[PDB]
Symmetry: D2
Subunit: 386 residues, 4 copies
Amino acid sequence: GLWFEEGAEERQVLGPFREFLKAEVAPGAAERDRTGAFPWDLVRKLAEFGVFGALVPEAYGGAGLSTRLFARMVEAIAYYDGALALTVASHNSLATGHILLAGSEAQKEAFLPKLASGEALGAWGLTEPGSGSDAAALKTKAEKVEGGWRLNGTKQFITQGSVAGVYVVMARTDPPPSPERKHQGISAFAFFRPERGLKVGRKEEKLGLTASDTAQLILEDLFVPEEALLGERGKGFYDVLRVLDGGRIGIAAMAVGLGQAALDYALAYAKGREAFGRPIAEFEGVSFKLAEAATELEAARLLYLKAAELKDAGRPFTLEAAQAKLFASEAAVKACDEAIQILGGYGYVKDYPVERYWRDARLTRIGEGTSEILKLVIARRLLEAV
Amino acid sequence: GLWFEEGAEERQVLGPFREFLKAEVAPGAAERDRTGAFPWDLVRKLAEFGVFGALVPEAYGGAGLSTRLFARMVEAIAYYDGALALTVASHNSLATGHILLAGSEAQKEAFLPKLASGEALGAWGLTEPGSGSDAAALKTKAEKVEGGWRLNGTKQFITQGSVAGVYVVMARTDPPPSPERKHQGISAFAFFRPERGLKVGRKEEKLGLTASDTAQLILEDLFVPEEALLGERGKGFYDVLRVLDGGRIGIAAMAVGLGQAALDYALAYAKGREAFGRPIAEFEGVSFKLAEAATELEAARLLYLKAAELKDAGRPFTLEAAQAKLFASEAAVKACDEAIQILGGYGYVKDYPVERYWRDARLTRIGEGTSEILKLVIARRLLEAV
Amino acid sequence: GLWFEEGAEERQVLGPFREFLKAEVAPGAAERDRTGAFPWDLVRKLAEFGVFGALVPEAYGGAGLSTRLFARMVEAIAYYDGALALTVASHNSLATGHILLAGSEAQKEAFLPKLASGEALGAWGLTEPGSGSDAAALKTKAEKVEGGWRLNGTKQFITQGSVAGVYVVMARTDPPPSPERKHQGISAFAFFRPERGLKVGRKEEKLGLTASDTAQLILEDLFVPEEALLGERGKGFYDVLRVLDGGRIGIAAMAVGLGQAALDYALAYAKGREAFGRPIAEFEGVSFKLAEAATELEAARLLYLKAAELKDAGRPFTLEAAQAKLFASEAAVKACDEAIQILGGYGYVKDYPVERYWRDARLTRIGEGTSEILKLVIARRLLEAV
Amino acid sequence: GLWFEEGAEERQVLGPFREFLKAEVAPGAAERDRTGAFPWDLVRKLAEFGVFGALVPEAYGGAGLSTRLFARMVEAIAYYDGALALTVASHNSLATGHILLAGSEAQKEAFLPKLASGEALGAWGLTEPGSGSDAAALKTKAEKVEGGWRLNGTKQFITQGSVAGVYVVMARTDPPPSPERKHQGISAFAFFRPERGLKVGRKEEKLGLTASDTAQLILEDLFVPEEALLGERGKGFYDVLRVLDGGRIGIAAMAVGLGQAALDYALAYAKGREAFGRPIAEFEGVSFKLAEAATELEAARLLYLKAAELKDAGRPFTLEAAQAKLFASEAAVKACDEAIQILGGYGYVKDYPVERYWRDARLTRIGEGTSEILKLVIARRLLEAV
């Protein structure tokens, strides 16, 4: 198999994985989108495929898979269930990926094994009501007290926020030297679900990804031990950036999966549905949409595979991960909107899955860095190289 | 006031109308989008403004308003409630507009008064499971029997389908001379809610316009009197086309209203929300979106006003109505998608109205002629003029 | 007649005007695009029509036409020759328009008569090598001396720069209170072609609009009399913006003219060229383009008509002129690009006019405020009314 | 190294090649664009490099390079001179590629040696005045006569048409079984520059790629020997499509090269030009464009690398070559258009290279299958696999 194709090893894993997804995940996707019922049943089963500890090395109880293979597994999941894919992508990339990145040997031995097994799902709290793109503008604070820390603040839109067993939260431990350096003085804290000090806010009704747990977290004089400190004090934001680079590859894979599903459905539909004495696929008004979407999704897949490769190769991939997520999310939503158009009135009804594909994919242009933010990251990298 | 602005007469009507909408319609829009509960309460009140008989001449119990003023009233409604605007636009344009167009004096006296008052809401059944864009491919049939007709067929996605008091259905009464002339042999039938022969199918769960009644109609040996025949036998499709031309102006106005709402919200939000030490509106990534959307919505408003004028002037407006609806629906959905982007994570939650604006507006690119179909109508008109 | 339509009086002027254009201007458009030879013959013939004094009141020897009619005339000219259109539009809108706006009674009696008759073509020099979008950053200075002022500096891309009989140059006369307000302290100066002190720079070849005089101006100790100061000292920048508001309407009209010509050519072509056994117009890949372009340029036409309307009514039109120019230029260029595509290989050869239409129209997105600048202007106004 | 990256061996060839290009090709690109003077000097110098025999096996005197490496070389050439790139790409892909694909051992020994050394430039004549996209509708005929065939007809837009030493022309030899299958009955003929019978037509000026030989060919009772028949009689069309599949990869590479040059120039420019007190690169209106273009052309590069990869592996690549060409051409032209916008007035003047990049790149969306045609090809393949 050529680089861009699934290798022998990849398809031996992805083949049965896809079969499992078709039989156990696809059937309840439409219902979960309506009820928002978290798939505790599927989490248990996916954990067995090492899906919840995919990048965690076996030494800590993980699957030790590569970024490339995991990215493809996320795309396969998203194809059948967007919410589940966000659940998997975020769990692995943010909470887990952050502990794997800055955690001390002791912290990794304590947290990784439980995250990797699905026993403890990971929530990663960066965003707050008053800051999203400008993440370093967070107001949560961590006061140094006898024996550890006391945290106070609110996190917004945290996935796995209400179902998490392990929480990673960013808070200011020191004042910034200047306003343009507010990213300094921020630290990260890793801890197990507190018995008190952490309450979840009102559930969030979302446009899509209904079964994905997203919640507001309110920390009230929450005490965490000295061992909670993750990474160097005051330099937590630097780790956040690194963590976000990795997560963007997964979100890009997620976008591609939803777009492909929408494209596959519109293709099949256009081939069967007929108008004016022939399949509507025979009208360029329809076929051109399919051709453009397919071309962009393929380009998007190549981009995320490339970004995954650079990471697996221990090489910088900030620019490449930003480009993949930006291109994939934009192309995927576009493809999904066109699939809706192609199905006509049926694209507007919940009896068919394309309207859901669009609603689910739509978040990919917002989460882990809006398209606008990513264009800034890309341009900056391009400009300093000049 | 200049032509494109609201005249003295227009604002004396639209001023209090908008006040009524803000106070009585806007408050329950979000809820209706969640419950799908048809606003019987608001229908009664809107009828008083002559909203359900706007184009019907006073002689038949209508408001006798112009196309231009009604179009603006539809835009004002859509601004606060998409479903209600579709309810109003369709009621007036299709069922009612068709009876006003081809009805005999006797039929107009019997139907118009009740439609115009809101007593009997109008359903217009053209679309079927197997034909949408290719409307003349409908399979419903009308068999000539003693005393009238017997209809058999299924209509799909009929607004006011389950709540209608008056129904207008298209059915084949005669075989077509050839396949390319299948539009021949189709007739229309106007009748009051049957005591039998007409059952509604399973409610339709839609991406948007939740509180809008859309239903499948199954005609089972439904008998209608000789007086049910609307227009000349076998030439009903010609009336359908004429009726669709008029309706497209209303749907264009509808699109503009939803887009404007989305634009107004994103403008206000971008002016308040701040990031990196300043209002996000100060970032071109955001401001450019607002500028493009506003420019296109204005162009869209001018286009539908123009189409409305040509109709009021008794002049052909097929091309102009197609251009207005196409431009407005496309621009409106685009503006709505950008408003979602601008609100970031908040654009993804139902606590805010932009996600609803998009879901509601999305249908405008599909209903009463898909954008693809409209481009065909436009091009054909352009080509024969060459 | 109907507002958005050409009235009886407009047709009486435009109808005969178009025939003149078709017979005297069209024939040599291709050649002028190749040689860049300034059309003195046509300038003289158009002047006899009062085209170069369209907006100048009859009291000063002009035609006393409305902005609406002038815009339509610019569109008509542009349809056949982009360079002539720019020549005519800039002359009337910039140098002439500025004197008509801020000039005293004496200056108007002195300049307007000769500009309106064409005896003197007007050049308006604002842009400099080091500032275009940021025009208030201009460096040309004029220092007070006995009898008047002495101007020193260079101007870039000045239309009519080398053939003009009257010049209006912007130069700093007083230091800016700060950088944030460098616009303050700039003045305007009107004067007949100098006997000495004004040098024309090495002419540069343009992508298009070849036959339009576009020159660099070098002012070396240029002396102008007291009566040269146009408007109040140091307050000329506000006048500059007002002048640009008006010019933008003409540039919008110019863009529409070129896009319409490209559309018309594509229509006729698509109707006669056959592929796969049928006119290519019967392929949606071609017809959809035709439909989209026609729709957008009509919309573009309505926007500049609106802007012109507001101006003729003595009302604010800054936002509207920006929207008209932005949309017309963007839509026109796209339409011209599509026309090239529709002609296939023939769109790439100079024996056909479509590649020239694009090259000519391409400047409309840059001159008199780039599309980017216009979006800022539009957004700011929308935000202020929020 | 990593697949999507230039390997050590590729760099050993490309690195030195680029310096040669920068020093010998770049200097006169602007002048060649103005004079249209065919670069014999550079052709001769490139030939000494085996550039004109890149894909020809060493056994026939060629360089025996992979499709991947050749594509990258075309991108590199195109970066500095579009016309040279087309000259090189068409030569290798079309006339040469066709003989290498369908030619017998004798023909290959006779033609390949001279084509690969550059001693004879290849011209491939398929397109005619009355057929481009519908190439199977060609009218040139070749009738069997004693000793061989006599060809009669005209070819349009033939690259290397007037300077070639070897020609490959497609002509009908047998009547089509029906119109739906006119492709059947077409044959290909390879022959050295005729002593008589071949006439070059009045050269026509192009929008861009001025220095590339593009000529009309008039065949009047042209005689070619028995050994001229390339491939089997009446079955040459299938070979034509295969030849086009390969050529499209080179056209994709060519588009990427031109877009990259435009991007690089815009980057450097945006980094040095200042407005409102800062490099214009710090304005999202500019930086977002830079980010989008960089992202799309990388994506475009990955697509043609993939297509080339499939071809080198002897695997089907029709769909992939179409996608690469479609995306690269569309993205490149847009990037070049944005670069013009970013330079403002300077993008409109010929003293700067961006307006040439666009003019050169514009043909990539038309030649070797228009974007519209490619979408049909892509869609059909997607539908077949559905």
